Design an enzyme around this catalytic site. Structure first.
Site, PDB file in Angstrom:
ATOM      1  CD  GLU A 145      64.189   3.433  25.536  1.00 40.52           C
ATOM      2  OE1 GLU A 145      63.376   3.351  26.490  1.00 40.52           O
ATOM      3  OE2 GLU A 145      64.264   4.439  24.785  1.00 40.52           O
TER       4      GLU A 145
ATOM      5  CB  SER B 221      52.880  -5.108  26.071  1.00 42.83           C
ATOM      6  OG  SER B 221      53.434  -4.998  24.768  1.00 42.83           O
TER       7      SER B 221
HETATM    8  C1  CE4 Z   1      49.007  -6.015  20.731  1.00 46.83           C
HETATM    9  C2  CE4 Z   1      49.730  -4.991  21.271  1.00 46.83           C
HETATM   10  C3  CE4 Z   1      49.554  -3.585  20.654  1.00 46.83           C
HETATM   11  S1  CE4 Z   1      51.094  -2.804  20.225  1.00 46.83           S
HETATM   12  C4  CE4 Z   1      51.748  -2.789  21.919  1.00 46.83           C
HETATM   13  C5  CE4 Z   1      53.258  -2.258  21.837  1.00 46.83           C
HETATM   14  N1  CE4 Z   1      54.176  -3.025  20.991  1.00 46.83           N
HETATM   15  C6  CE4 Z   1      54.575  -2.543  19.797  1.00 46.83           C
HETATM   16  O1  CE4 Z   1      54.172  -1.467  19.358  1.00 46.83           O
HETATM   17  C7  CE4 Z   1      55.582  -3.340  19.048  1.00 46.83           C
HETATM   18  N2  CE4 Z   1      55.253  -4.282  18.162  1.00 46.83           N
HETATM   19  O2  CE4 Z   1      53.869  -4.478  18.036  1.00 46.83           O
HETATM   20  C8  CE4 Z   1      53.624  -5.294  16.860  1.00 46.83           C
HETATM   21  C9  CE4 Z   1      56.991  -2.989  19.277  1.00 46.83           C
HETATM   22  C10 CE4 Z   1      57.498  -2.388  20.423  1.00 46.83           C
HETATM   23  S2  CE4 Z   1      59.199  -2.123  20.266  1.00 46.83           S
HETATM   24  C11 CE4 Z   1      59.135  -2.829  18.668  1.00 46.83           C
HETATM   25  N3  CE4 Z   1      60.245  -2.948  17.911  1.00 46.83           N
HETATM   26  N4  CE4 Z   1      57.935  -3.220  18.291  1.00 46.83           N
HETATM   27  C12 CE4 Z   1      53.828  -2.255  23.242  1.00 46.83           C
HETATM   28  O3  CE4 Z   1      55.039  -2.545  23.358  1.00 46.83           O
HETATM   29  O4  CE4 Z   1      53.045  -1.996  24.180  1.00 46.83           O
HETATM   30  N5  CE4 Z   1      51.638  -4.204  22.549  1.00 46.83           N
HETATM   31  C13 CE4 Z   1      50.774  -5.094  22.276  1.00 46.83           C
HETATM   32  C14 CE4 Z   1      50.443  -6.080  23.269  1.00 46.83           C
HETATM   33  O5  CE4 Z   1      50.598  -7.279  22.965  1.00 46.83           O
HETATM   34  O6  CE4 Z   1      50.053  -5.695  24.388  1.00 46.83           O
HETATM   35  C1  CE4 Z   2      62.685  -3.675  20.015  1.00 44.63           C
HETATM   36  C2  CE4 Z   2      63.247  -2.436  20.114  1.00 44.63           C
HETATM   37  C3  CE4 Z   2      63.145  -1.691  21.468  1.00 44.63           C
HETATM   38  S1  CE4 Z   2      62.857   0.072  21.305  1.00 44.63           S
HETATM   39  C4  CE4 Z   2      64.415   0.406  20.418  1.00 44.63           C
HETATM   40  C5  CE4 Z   2      64.404   1.958  19.945  1.00 44.63           C
HETATM   41  N1  CE4 Z   2      63.303   2.305  19.051  1.00 44.63           N
HETATM   42  C6  CE4 Z   2      62.270   3.085  19.419  1.00 44.63           C
HETATM   43  O1  CE4 Z   2      62.156   3.566  20.546  1.00 44.63           O
HETATM   44  C7  CE4 Z   2      61.268   3.341  18.346  1.00 44.63           C
HETATM   45  N2  CE4 Z   2      61.477   4.317  17.463  1.00 44.63           N
HETATM   46  O2  CE4 Z   2      62.686   4.994  17.686  1.00 44.63           O
HETATM   47  C8  CE4 Z   2      62.953   5.825  16.549  1.00 44.63           C
HETATM   48  C9  CE4 Z   2      60.048   2.541  18.241  1.00 44.63           C
HETATM   49  C10 CE4 Z   2      59.754   1.406  18.974  1.00 44.63           C
HETATM   50  S2  CE4 Z   2      58.208   0.793  18.516  1.00 44.63           S
HETATM   51  C11 CE4 Z   2      58.046   2.091  17.365  1.00 44.63           C
HETATM   52  N3  CE4 Z   2      56.944   2.198  16.599  1.00 44.63           N
HETATM   53  N4  CE4 Z   2      59.070   2.915  17.330  1.00 44.63           N
HETATM   54  C12 CE4 Z   2      65.718   2.210  19.230  1.00 44.63           C
HETATM   55  O3  CE4 Z   2      65.664   2.672  18.068  1.00 44.63           O
HETATM   56  O4  CE4 Z   2      66.759   1.894  19.859  1.00 44.63           O
HETATM   57  N5  CE4 Z   2      64.599  -0.625  19.242  1.00 44.63           N
HETATM   58  C13 CE4 Z   2      63.930  -1.693  19.058  1.00 44.63           C
HETATM   59  C14 CE4 Z   2      63.986  -2.439  17.772  1.00 44.63           C
HETATM   60  O5  CE4 Z   2      62.983  -2.399  17.022  1.00 44.63           O
HETATM   61  O6  CE4 Z   2      65.027  -3.053  17.468  1.00 44.63           O
END
Ligand code: CE4
Ligand code: CE4
Length: 269
Positions: A145, A47
Site C-alpha cells: 500500500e 521500495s
Molecule cells: C526494480 C524494482 C523491482 S519491482 C520492486 C516492487 N515494485 C513493483 O513491483 C511495482 N512496480 O514495479 C515496476 C509496483 C508496486 S505497487 C505498483 N502499482 N507497482 C517494490 O515495490 O518493491 N521495486 C523495484 C525497485 O526499484 O526496487
Molecule cells: C500503487 C498502488 C499501491 S498497492 C494498491 C493495491 N494493490 C495491490 O496490493 C496489488 N494487487 O492487489 C490486487 C499489487 C501491487 S503491485 C502488484 N503486482 N499487485 C490496491 O489494489 O489497492 N494499488 C496500487 C495501484 O497500482 O494503484
C-alpha cells in the site's frame, strides 16, 4: 551554493523533458561540496525505504547478538506481490539477515513486511530514523500500500537531502557500529536492481552500493547510493522522481542522467 547554480538549468531541462519532478541531492564527502535540486521536497520512498529498514535491523543487532541468525518461518499469506527470494524459502523459512539482504538486493516485499513486523511496523522504522537525527523520513504503511505515490500525500515520503544525510550517517558515519556499518555497505554493494540507475552514471572502476525504489505509478521511481571513486573520498547522492498523472511512466534513463548531472556539478569526472 554555486555548484547548485551550475546545473540548475540542465536539471530544469531534464525534468521538463521527463514530464515530472526530479529531486537530487549529492554530497562530496571529501570537500563537503553539495548539489541540490528540489532536494528538500518530499518524494515517495517506494521500495527505497527497504535500505533503511535493513539498517534499522542492523542497529538492533548491535545489542541482540542472535538477531541476524534468527530463523523466521512464514506462511503463504505472508507472500505479497514481488517476493522473488522469500517465495523460494516458503517451505523452509529464512534468517533475519537473509530477509534483510533480500529486501535490499531484490526489493523482496514479503521480506520487507516480515522485517517491519520485527521492528514494530512503520512507526518503528520511523523511530529509528529519528534516532539518527532524520526529522523528515516517514513510513506510514506496509507493502504494497505504501507505493500509492498520490500527489500531495506526505505518507511514506522523505526528501532527497534527508535520504542522503541519513545514508551518509549509516554507511560512512557513526550511526552504526563498524561491523554493522560494513554489513550495510556490503548489502548495498550487492544490490541487483539498480544497474540502469546511479550505477549507469559512474565509471566502471567505481565501487557502488545503492538501493532503488519503483512505485509503479505517477512516474515515481528513485535510487540512492554511496559511490567510491578509485583512490578518492566517496560521494553520497539521492535521485527521486514523480509525475502528475497516475499512468505516467517512470524513467531509469532520467535517474541515470540526473546522477550524471549531479556528479558533473560536484566536479567529479
Ligand atoms: C526494480 C524494482 C523491482 S519491482 C520492486 C516492487 N515494485 C513493483 O513491483 C511495482 N512496480 O514495479 C515496476 C509496483 C508496486 S505497487 C505498483 N502499482 N507497482 C517494490 O515495490 O518493491 N521495486 C523495484 C525497485 O526499484 O526496487
Ligand atoms: C500503487 C498502488 C499501491 S498497492 C494498491 C493495491 N494493490 C495491490 O496490493 C496489488 N494487487 O492487489 C490486487 C499489487 C501491487 S503491485 C502488484 N503486482 N499487485 C490496491 O489494489 O489497492 N494499488 C496500487 C495501484 O497500482 O494503484
Amino acid at each position: 551554493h554555486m555548484l547548485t547554480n551550475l546545473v540548475a538549468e540542465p536539471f530544469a531541462k531534464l525534468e521538463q523533458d521527463f514530464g515530472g519532478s526530479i529531486g537530487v541531492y549529492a554530497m562530496d564527502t571529501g570537500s563537503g561540496a553539495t548539489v541540490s535540486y528540489r532536494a528538500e521536497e518530499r518524494f515517495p520512498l517506494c521500495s527505497s525505504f527497504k535500505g533503511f529498514l535493513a539498517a534499522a535491523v542492523l542497529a538492533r543487532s548491535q545489542q541482540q547478538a542472535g538477531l541476524l541468525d534468527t530463523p523466521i518461518r512464514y506462511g503463504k499469506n505472508a507472500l505479497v506481490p514481488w517476493s522473488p527470494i522469500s517465495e523460494k524459502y516458503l517451505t523452509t523459512g529464512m534468517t533475519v539477515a537473509e530477509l534483510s539482504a533480500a529486501a535490499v538486493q531484490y526489493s523482496d516485499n514479503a521480506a520487507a513486511n516480515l522485517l517491519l513486523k520485527e521492528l514494530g511496523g512503520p512507526a518503528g522504522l520511523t523511530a529509528f530514523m529519528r534516532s539518527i537525527g532524520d526529522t523528515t523520513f516517514r513510513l506510514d504503511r506496509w507493502e504494497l500500500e505504501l507505493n500509492s505515490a498520490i500527489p500531495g500525500d506526505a505518507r511514506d515520503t522523505s526528501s532527497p537531502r534527508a535520504v542522503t544525510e541519513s545514508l551518509q550517517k549509516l554507511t560512512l558515519g557513526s550511526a552504526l557500529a563498524a561491523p554493522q556499518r560494513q554489513q550495510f555497505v556490503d548489502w548495498l554493494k550487492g544490490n541487483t536492481t539498480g544497474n540502469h540507475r546511479i550505477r549507469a552514471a559512474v565509471p566502471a572502476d567505481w565501487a557502488v552500493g545503492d538501493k532503488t525504489g519503483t512505485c509503479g505509478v505517477y512516474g515515481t521511481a528513485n535510487d540512492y547510493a554511496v559511490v567510491w571513486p578509485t583512490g578518492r573520498a566517496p560521494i553520497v547522492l539521492a535521485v527521486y522522481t514523480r509525475a502528475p498523472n497516475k499512468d505516467d511512466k517512470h524513467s531509469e534513463a532520467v535517474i541515470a542522467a540526473a546522477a550524471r548531472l549531479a556528479l558533473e556539478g560536484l566536479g567529479v569526472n
